[PDB]
Write a protein that binds this ligand. Structure first.
Ligand SMILES: CCCCCCCCCO[C@@H]1O[C@H](CO)[C@@H](O)[C@H](O)[C@H]1O
Ligand SMILES: CCCCCCCCCO[C@@H]1O[C@H](CO)[C@@H](O)[C@H](O)[C@H]1O
Ligand SMILES: CC(C)S[C@@H]1O[C@H](CO)[C@H](O)[C@H](O)[C@H]1O
Length: 366
């Protein structure tokens, strides 16, 4: 019952995190159906993200008063309704309105999920994280291939059904802030996160219309990279799993360094299928190391109020996604979408330094 009552959430984290990134493999399709240009559709990522940023904190506030599995139901219900609206969406406006619906559930979910794994008890958090992790590897790739044969609306409708079958699996298994603002080390971590995420989502958001409209390759080759990155992620995630309980500083910095490289070398490694592919192998490995790197450290640094740690982590993570989407959008629209790799490499340089600085300053851990 423990493993189940938690594996059900680990799955549940897979759904929410799967959803928000699926648009990355669906920009062309979504654009085609609405007679706009790829990058223009990129903003539904920012809108989503920034709603999760704005509401992660106020929503949990209001919601924590009354917080049974009841709340998960109403998330899932809204999640499921919104996803039905995406499928029916009769304008790119209606689509993005639907994305807010999801984001409202998203916002609330990810405040809560940190604790609940523990309340059914631990290492409940790896499971959650495994789900988080298995989103990039199975979720997003398979979401593209579905969007290939069947198109984007079915992809969105599909996910809505998961939420249900998992909701039903869910129902069968049932029953502050100034202190953190005054942990500079935690704040510094919250800082590093915001920045490095913007760096990565400058580029990663538009990788599809990049591999298609800019590097010239097939829409199959794009889908190919997305698989490679996900699995690259498995390597990355299991490098950490086995080696992140120590070495956390060094891994994270070298990772961020690796990311730096990849972002700079995006345009030069294009026109070299094998090149972009390796890039993908390294990029991916960096992505998960950095991604889990922060979650682990925030939790470490905030034992007495983990969920509020995580509530902040959630929101402040989503600033970076909207940031990177938007800057990625704007470079693509106004100067060239080839300079997304380079533009993003600027926030990544800063982060490398900030990384090394703060790990020197606070070597304490465990
Ligand atoms: C102040 C210097 C910036 C350093 C980063 C410290 C975290 C503060 C960022 O605030 C953000 O704005 C939202 C608006 O409501 C809030 O919900 C929530 O706090 C958070 O997502
Ligand atoms: C010279 C010493 C370097 C140490 C300073 C740490 C880097 C913090 C910069 O973050 C800024 O925050 C914005 C998000 O709000 C970003 O979008 C913006 O591009 C970036 O400029
Ligand atoms: C980049 C993805 C992991 S999204 C990210 O996951 C985090 C930890 O799993 C936080 O809980 C955020 O709420 C969520 O948006």
């Amino acid at each position: 019952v423990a493993w189940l009552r938690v594996v059900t959430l680990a799955v549940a984290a897979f759904i929410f995190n799967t959803t928000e990134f699926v648009p990355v493999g669906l920009l062309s399709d979504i654009a085609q159906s609405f007679h706009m240009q790829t990058a223009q559709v990129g903003i539904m990522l920012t809108i989503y993200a920034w709603v999760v940023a704005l509401m992660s904190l106020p929503f949990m506030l209001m919601t924590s008063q009354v917080e049974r599995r009841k709340l998960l139901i109403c998330l899932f219900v809204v999640f499921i309704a919104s996803h039905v609206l995406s499928f029916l969406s009769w304008s790119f406006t209606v689509l993005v309105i639907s994305r807010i619906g999801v984001a409202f559930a998203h916002a609330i979910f990810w405040s809560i999920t940190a604790s609940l794994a523990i309340r059914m008890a631990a290492q409940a958090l790896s499971l959650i994280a495994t789900g988080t992790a298995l989103a990039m590897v199975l979720g997003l790739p398979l979401g593209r291939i579905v969007g290939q044969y069947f198109g984007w609306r079915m992809t969105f409708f599909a996910i809505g059904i998961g939420a249900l079958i998992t909701l039903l699996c869910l129902i069968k298994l049932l029953p502050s802030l100034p202190l953190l603002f005054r942990r500079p080390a935690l704040m510094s971590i919250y800082l590093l996160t915001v920045v490095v995420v913007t760096a990565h989502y400058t580029a990663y958001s538009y990788i599809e219309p990049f591999v298609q409209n800019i590097a010239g390759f097939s829409a199959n080759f794009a889908t190919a990279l997305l698989l490679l990155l996900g699995g690259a992620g498995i390597i990355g995630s299991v490098i950490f799993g086995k080696l992140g309980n120590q070495y956390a500083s060094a891994l994270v910095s070298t990772a961020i360094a690796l990311l730096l490289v990849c972002l700079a070398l995006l345009l030069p490694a294009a026109n070299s299928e094998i090149h972009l592919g390796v890039l993908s192998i390294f990029w991916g490995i960096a992505m998960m190391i950095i991604g889990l790197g922060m979650q682990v450290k925030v939790l470490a640094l905030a034992p007495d109020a983990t969920d509020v740690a995580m509530a902040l982590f959630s929101g402040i993570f989503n600033i970076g996604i909207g940031a990177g989407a938007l800057v990625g959008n704007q470079v693509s629209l106004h100067w060239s979408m080839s300079m997304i790799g380079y533009v993003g490499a600027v926030p990544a340089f800063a982060a490398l330094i900030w990384s090394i600085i703060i790990f020197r300053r606070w070597p304490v851990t465990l």
